[PDB]
Amino acid sequence: DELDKIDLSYETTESGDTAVSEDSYDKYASNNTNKEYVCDFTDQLKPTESGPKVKKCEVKVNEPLIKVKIICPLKGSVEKLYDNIEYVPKKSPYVVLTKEETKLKEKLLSKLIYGLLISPTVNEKENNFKEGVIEFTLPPVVHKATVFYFICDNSKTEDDNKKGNRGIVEVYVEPYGNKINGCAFLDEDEEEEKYGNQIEEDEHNEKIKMKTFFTQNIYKKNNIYPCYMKLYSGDIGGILFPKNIKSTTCFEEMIPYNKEIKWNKENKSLGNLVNNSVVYNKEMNAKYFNVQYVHIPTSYKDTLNLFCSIILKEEESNLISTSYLVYVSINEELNFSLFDFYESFVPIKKTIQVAQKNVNNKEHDYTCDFTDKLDKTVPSTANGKKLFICRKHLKEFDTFTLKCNVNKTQYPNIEIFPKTLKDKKEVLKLDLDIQYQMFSKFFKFNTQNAKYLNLYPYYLIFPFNHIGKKELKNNPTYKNHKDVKYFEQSSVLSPLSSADSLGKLLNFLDTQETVCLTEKIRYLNLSINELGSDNNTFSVTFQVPPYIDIKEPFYFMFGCNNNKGEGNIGIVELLISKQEEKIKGCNFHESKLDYFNENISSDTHECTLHAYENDIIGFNCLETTHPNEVEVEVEDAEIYLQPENCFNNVYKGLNSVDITTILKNAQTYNINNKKTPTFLKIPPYNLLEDVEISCQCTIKQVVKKIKVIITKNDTVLLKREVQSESTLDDKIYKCEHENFINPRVNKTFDENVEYTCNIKIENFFNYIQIFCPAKDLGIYKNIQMYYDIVKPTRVPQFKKFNNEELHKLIPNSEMLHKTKEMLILYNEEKVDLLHFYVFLPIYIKDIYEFNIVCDNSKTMWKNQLGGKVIYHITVSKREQKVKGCSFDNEHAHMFSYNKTNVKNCIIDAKPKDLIGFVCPSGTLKLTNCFKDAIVHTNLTNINGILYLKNNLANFTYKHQFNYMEIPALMDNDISFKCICVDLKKKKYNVKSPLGPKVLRALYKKLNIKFDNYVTGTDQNKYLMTYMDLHLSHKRNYLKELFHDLGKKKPADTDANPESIIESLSINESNESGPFPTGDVDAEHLILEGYDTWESLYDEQLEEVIYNDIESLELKDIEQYVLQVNLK
Amino acid sequence: SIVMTQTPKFLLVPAGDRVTITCKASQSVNNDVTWYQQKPGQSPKLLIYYASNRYTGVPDRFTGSGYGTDFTFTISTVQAEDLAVYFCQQDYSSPLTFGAGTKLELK
Amino acid sequence: DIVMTQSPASLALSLGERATLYCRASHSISSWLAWYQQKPGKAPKLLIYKASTLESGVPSRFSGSGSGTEFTLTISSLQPDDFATYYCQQYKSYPWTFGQGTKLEIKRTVAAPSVFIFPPSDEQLKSGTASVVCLLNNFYPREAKVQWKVDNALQSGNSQESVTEQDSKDSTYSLSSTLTLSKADYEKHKVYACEVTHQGLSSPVTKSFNRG
Amino acid sequence: QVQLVQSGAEVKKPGSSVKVSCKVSGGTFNTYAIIWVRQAPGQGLEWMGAIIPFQDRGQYAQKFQGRVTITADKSTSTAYMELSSLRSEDTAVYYCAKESGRAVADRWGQGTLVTVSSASTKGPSVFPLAPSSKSTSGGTAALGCLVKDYFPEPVTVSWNSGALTSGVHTFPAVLQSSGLYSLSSVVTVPSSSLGTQTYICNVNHKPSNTKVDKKVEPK
C-alpha cells in the first residue's frame, strides 16, 4: 500500500538546488507544548525577498512515547503564495529520508525504529502531505540513535522578484528506556539459548529485536503461565498481541477485580478507572507493529487490580476459542501484608495506597499525608469508619515522611500509635515467619534468602489469594501460631461486623512487639517533630541508612488513630531490604569494617578510590561498636574533620567546593549523633573528566587523607574476570564467593563481572560443591546450566549440564545431594537441595579439563541483576582398578575381572585394598553391604565389627557406586555378602534409594533376619544421597493451579473469571501434610539449622514393587551376590 | 597539625660559598613542600615549589632537594644581596604550616 | 572504484588566454563532480561544488559543464591568481577518487640556461666525501639535460637533480645537479666537467675546473 | 564561520603507529560526515575513509583495511585518526574534510605531513659553494651553499638574514640512498661586488635544532 512503496533511490542533498550551506541554516526547533514537537511551515515557505533561506526544523527526542507533528501548507492555501510547492518524500508519514554516504535516501521509519505508532487517520483526514499534515508517535524505548529527514521545498515558488524558501525537518533521536513492562505474544515456540553469545553469527534481523523489548515473552505453544503485567506510577506498559487476534478487551472493555465493593458492573475503561491515564493505539492501526502502550500518571497513588482477555482467529475446531487471560497490575508495593492474609481484618473497608513522590520534586522522596483522610465523616454514611493504609518498599538513601494532623480544633484527642513513638521512637515490629513458610511451599523459597524477600512474584496475592487463605486455615503448622486467633474462621453464631473487626485490629496493634527504629537499624537518621511551625500538624521524617546491616528485612508500621474522635485510622506499611554488601570506602581506624571494601593499615596514611555512577563511597575515622564490645554512653572524640562537613563541601585542593558543583545533584548521607562516617551516592552526571575530591581527618595527632577519583569513561569496561582457587573443607571442594550467583545492585562497573573457580583433583573423596539451584519463579527465573570441554578435545559446541551428560564425559560418576539425617527411622530426611555435589570414581582415565557454568545473570531487574559463576575443574590421572565384579557387560571397563553373567562372585581381600560394588542395570539393591551387610544370612552393621570410622564405607553407602577400604587391624576372619535382587518379570528404574518398606519385604522373602542391629552415634556430620538431578516429585502447586484454570477458560465471553478463580482450589491430598511427621528430638542443630525436610522414597514405584514382591515366588527371583573374605 | 622544624636558626657563610638549609617534617608529605625568601622591608618571594623545582624566573643558584620527611634548600654561590631569612612550607594537609625560619649572614 | 581520467597533464599559458580543463569518468555518471584548486603549499580548495554551480567567493570566470562520461571545465581568462594545480573528484559512490592533476604554467618563452660549477671546499674534503654542484640558472623550458664528466669519463648514477617552481617574475626556475664522490676518488682525478644541453642552446655549454 | 584544524607534522619509525587529530569548529558536528584524503607528493590524491559522528561505525576504502582507523568524539567535536603498521611509501600529506550538506566536501583542513623513512634525527652539514674566482668579472656571478646529510624535512635557508631576495633559489630537497635529505641554495650577485660585499647564508633545521651560518667568499 501507500505505507511502503520504497523502490526509488532519489539521490538528493539537504539544500537541494539552493546554494545555501549549513553555516547559514536557520536552525530552530519544533515548539514544545504538552509533549508535542510541532514545527508548522505556515507562512515560512512563502515567496519573499532575501532568499531562498533554508529553514530547518530540528526535533530532538529524548523522552518515551513522544508525539511528533509536522504541517506544510497546500497548493492554493493563499493566493499565489504557495504554487508549485513540492513535498519530499511523497510518502512521508512512514517513508523517511535517511543519510548514507553524502546523500539523502528514502527508508522505512518502521525498520529504523521498531514500534512506530503510525496513525492512518489524523483529524478524520488522511495522514500525508497530500493533506498537508503528517502525524506519528514514537515508541517508549529506543535501542540506538536514529536520524531521518523530511523535505518541504518551495524553491520553485516565485512572484516577480520574490522566491520561496526551502523547509527541512531533522528529527534526532537518542537512546532512552530499557524495556516495556508487559507481554510479547510471539509466533514461535519456546526455546532456550546457550550460555554463550558466539552463535550470533547470523545477521541483525528483525526477529531478535522483538524478543529483547518486553520483560515477559509468551510463546505460541507449550505455554504454562499466563501473563502478569505490573505497572507503577510514572511507568509504562504495553502488550504485543498475536497476529491472529480476533478481539481484545484489554483496553476500554476491561474488568476490575475487587469483589468487596464492586456492583457487578460488566466492563469499565482504563481512562475512567485511572484518572489522567492515556491509552495509545486504541484502534490497533499500524503497518506491522500491533502494539498498544499505556502511561500511568505520577500523581496516581491508588492500588487496583484488573483482568482482560485476548481472542484469536480460527479458534480450535469450530467455535472453541483458546483465549488468553493476562493480568494487569498498576500499583502494588509491599503487598504481602497481614491485612490480606488474615480473614478477621477482611470485613473492615480500607483504602490501600502507595507512597507518592513528594511535591519537592526529589526523585527519592516519598510522602503520605492523612490530613484529609482522618476527618470525622458525615453520620449519614452507613458504611462506617474507614482504614487508610500506605504501603512502600524502601531502599538505600530513600527518604520517607509521614504527615499527620493533630489540631484540636478539627481532630481532638487523636492518638498516635505506637504510644511510645513520640518518646522512645518505637515502631510495631512484625514477624515474617508465615511469609517464609508460604513462600517455601509455592515459590521454593529458602530462609537463607530472606534478605531478597518481596522480589518473588506477586501471584500469592492476586489472582490466587484464596489459596493463601485456605493454606493458613487447613495446614496444622499455623494452628499454634501466636496470631492464630486472628486468621481463624468466623461462625454464624459468632460473626464479625465492621465494629468487631475494628476492635480486633486495635487489639492486634496493641499486642505486636515494639522495637525502637534507631536501635534496630543503625546509621538511620530519624527526626520527629511533635508540632510543626503551623501549630496543626505532627510529622515523622527519616532517611534509610546507606547500608542495611540486618540479617532479615525489617517490617513494621506506625501512624495515627482517631477512633476516640469517631474518625478514621491511618497506617503506613514499610519494608527495608539490603541492596549491596560492600561499600568502597577507606577506614583509617584500627577497628575493621566488614562492609568497607578497603581497610587501611595504620602504617599507611593515604587512601585512593575510583568512583562511578550509582556507587557509594564511605569515609570513617572513628570507632565502631562491634557485638563483642559493650555499648556505653561515651562522648564522641574530638575528631578534627576538615571541612567540618566532609562530603557536602569537599576539598578540591586547598579551597572548599560544594559537591553539587562537581556532581549533578549528589545525594549525601551523614549521622546526626556521630561525626563520622559520611557517605555519598554518585548521581548520574555529565562531568566525564577525571576529577579529584578529598577529605581529611586527624586521628591521634596524625592526619589521614582520602582521595576519590570520579571518572565516567566514554566506553565502560568490557569485562572484569576474577579467578579464585577452590579450598578443601572437610574433604569437600569449596569455592569462596560462590553466592555471587545471587542478584546484585546494578552498579555501572558491576554489570559484567564474571567469577571463575579453579578446581584441581588429585586425590579420592572428590566432592565438588556447586551452588546452582533449579530455575524457579522470582530470583532464579533464568538459571541455565551449561558445560564445555577443553581437554583432550576442545568441543566447540556448548551443551547443557545434567547427570547423563556428566556420565558420558566421565564414566561411572555421579551427582549427589547433601543429606544430614539423624535417625533412619524417620520418613523424611534433611536435605540441602540448593547445592549438588559431583562425585568422580578413582579411575580418572586421563587429564579432563572442563567448565561448568550457570548464567543467572540472564535474570535482570530494574535495580538488581543476577550473577554468573564458572567452575573450572581439572582432574589428575589415576590407574587404580577397584576390586569388584562386572555382573553386566556395561560394567566391564571398571573392573579387572570379566564377571559377566557370574551371579556368585567371591573376592579374597587383604588390608590396604579398595573394593567397589555395582548392581546390574535396573536391579534392586538389597542391602548397603557397607553400613548394613549380610553376615551368615543375618543383616549386620559391619561398621562396628570392623571399627570403621569416617572411611569410604560410611561415606559411600548410599550411592549407586559403593566403595570400601579394608581396615588395618581386624579381630578375626570375617565374611560378608552383598546381594542385588533382580525380578525376572520386569525391569525396574530405581531412581531413589529403596525405602525400609520395600527392603523389609525383600528380607522376609529372601530369608534375612535383623534383631541385633545397632545404629550409629555420629554427630555433626554429612552424607551424600542420590536423587535424580532435579526432584520431579516436588509438585509445582502454581503450575497445577494455572493448568486447571486454563482448562476452565476463565474469560471467553462474559465468563466472570473472578468466580472461576475462586472455585479453583488445589486438593490437599496431593501433599503428605506436615513433613516433620512423628516425634522429632530436634537436638541436631548445626550451621544452617532446620533446612527443607523432603521425602526421598518414591512411594508410587515402591508400592508397585511391594505388590510385585508379595505376588512373586522364589523361582522368579534371581540373586547377584558379591562375597568378600577379610583375613 | 603538621609542624615544620627548620635548622640551623642562624647560619653564617662567606660570600661566594655554598650554603645549605635543612627542613624536617612530622609525617609523610610526599612532594608538597615550598621554600620562601624574604628581605627586610620587603614581601617574601617564592623560590622552590614541589620541593625540588625552581619557580619561573628564579636564579639557577637556588636549588632544593628532599622527599618524604627530610628536605634541604641549597644555594650554590651566595651573593652579597642574598642576606635574607628563609622559610619552608608544607602543602599536603590544611592548615598549611610555615617553618620557624632561618637567617643567612655574611662574615 | 570510479576512475578520474583527468587530462591533460600540464598547460602553459600567459595572462588573458583561455584554459579548458577536462575530467572523464570510467562510466556514465549523472553529475556529482567537483573541481579542487591547489597551489604548491595550499590546502585543496573547493571552487565548483556541482555540475556547474560555484561556491561563494569563487570568481565568475570559472564555468563548469558536461555530464555523463565526459565533463569539461572552461576558464574564460586567466588572472595572476589563477595558476595552480587542479584536481577533479567524483562522489556518486562512497569510494571517492582524485585525478592525476593538471598544471598551469605561466608564460611561454624559451630562455637558455646559465651554467655554473662549484668545486668542493677544503672543510668538506676533511670529511671523506667530495661534492660538486652544477647550477642551471634561469632556463626555459624545464627539459634541460645535465651530464657529469670526470677526466673526460662519463659519470652516471652518482648524481641527483632538483628543480624549483616556476616564478612569474621572469619565468625563472633553476635546476641544481650535484655529483657525490668520496674524498679518495677526488684526489685520484683532476679534471671535472659538467655538460648542459637545452633547447635554447645552439651547442652544449660546459663548465670545468682543474683541481684534485 | 566553520574552520578545520589539524595537528602538526610527525615522523614515526616503520612498524609504529601515527595519530592525526582533527577538529571541526562552527556549524554542527553530529549530522555531517567527515572525510579523509591523503596524497603522495607528485601524484594524485587518495581517498581513505569517512565517518558520521552520531554513529561510531565508520567505513574505509576497499583497499585499506585494519591499518586505517577513523573515530569521532562528539564531546570534544573531534575526528581523530589512528594509522597503524606504517610502511614505506606512506610518506605523504594527509588531508581532512567534511561535507556541508551539498553532498560534496566543501571545507578542508590545513593538512598534515607524515614521514616513514627508517632514518633518524640528524643535523645538516653546510659547505660553501664559492663563486667562480676569476679576473673576468662582469657583474654576473653565482654563489651558494650545500646542505647535506640531514633528516627529516624541513630545513629553511635564508641569505643575509633575509636580504637581496632577487635571484636566490632554494632547491627542493632530494633523498639519498643512505636515507638522508640534501639540497642546495644559490644566489646570483654582481661579480664586482664580491670584493666589497659579504654574503652570509642562514641554515635552520628545526627537527635537530641545528642553526648554522656560513660565509661564502671567492677561493
Residue numbers in the entry:
A (entry chain A): 555 to 1681
B (entry chain C): 1 to 107
C (entry chain E): 1 to 212
D (entry chain D): 1 to 219
What did the published study say regarding this structure?
Two sexual-stage surface proteins essential for Plasmodium transmission, Pfs230 (5) and Pfs48/45 (6), are expressed in both gametocytes and gametes. Pfs230 contains fourteen 6-Cys domains, whereas Pfs48/45 contains three.
Our cryo-EM structure reveals that 2A2 targets Pfs230D4, confirming the epitope location previously proposed based on the differential binding and TRA of mAb 2A2 against P. falciparum strains that contain SNPs in Pfs230D4 (38). Most residues contacted by the antibody lie in the canonical perpendicular β-hairpin of Pfs230D4 (β5-β6) and surrounding regions (β2-β4 regions). The potency was on par with the highly potent RUPA-97 that targets Pfs230D1 (IC80 = 0.7 μg/mL), suggesting that a common feature of these mAbs might be responsible for the high potency. These two mAbs, despite binding different domains, bind to the same side of Pfs230 with a similar angle of approach. mAb 18F25 (IC80 < 30 μg/ml) also binds to the same face of Pfs230, while differing slightly in its angle of approach. Intriguingly, the epitopes of potent mAbs RUPA-97, 2A2, and 18F25 are localized to the opposite face of where Pfs48/45 and presumably the PPM would be.
